[PDB]
Structure 1
Amino acid sequence: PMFEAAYDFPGSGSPSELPLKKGDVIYITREEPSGWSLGKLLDGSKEGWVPTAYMKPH
């Protein structure tokens, strides 16, 4: 589904992360019990993991 980032997520540098700025809209495809969700900001480019905590309905 589609979510908007409710917090900034600069990340750590990990290539597995998807850095977010608050307000960014992205498509989440998977949500894992570790507390991470896999998303793609909407052009089809960059995919990676973001905190589920930070995803608000859009």
Structure 2
Amino acid sequence: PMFEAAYDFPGSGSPSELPLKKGDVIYITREEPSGWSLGKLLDGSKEGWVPTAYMKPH
């Protein structure tokens, strides 16, 4: 399903993370027991880890 970022997430921890601005709608495919979710931009141009807690239903 699709989810929208509720908070900015610069994603500076690693290159495997997906930077988001508040307002960005993305696909989420998996939510992990680490507290991280795997997201993908709607145009398929990038994917990466985002904090599950930042993402609200869209």
Q: What is the TM-score when the length of structure 2 is the normalising length?
A: 0.95
Structure 1 residue 41 displacement after superposition: 1.1
Q: How many residues align?
A: 58
Structure 1 residue 13 displacement after superposition: 5.1
% identical equivalent positions: 100
SS in 2 for 1:16: coil
| CA-to-aligned-CA distance 1:35-56 (integer Å, 9 cap, x gap) | 0000001001100000000000
| CA spacing shift, 1:3–1:34, aligned 2, 3 Å | same
Structure 1 spans left out of the alignment, 5+ residues: none
Q: Which residue of 1 aligns with 2:50?
A: 50
Structure 1 residue 25 displacement after superposition: 0.2
- The structure 1 segments of at least 4 consecutive aligned residues displaced by more than 3 Å after TM superposition are none
| CA-to-aligned-CA distance 1:22-45 (integer Å, 9 cap, x gap) | 000000011101100000010011
Q: What is the TM-score when the length of structure 1 is the normalising length?
A: 0.95
Structure 1 residue 3 displacement after superposition: 0.1
Structure 2 spans left out of the alignment, 5+ residues: none
Greater Cα shift, 25-34 or 9-18: 9-18
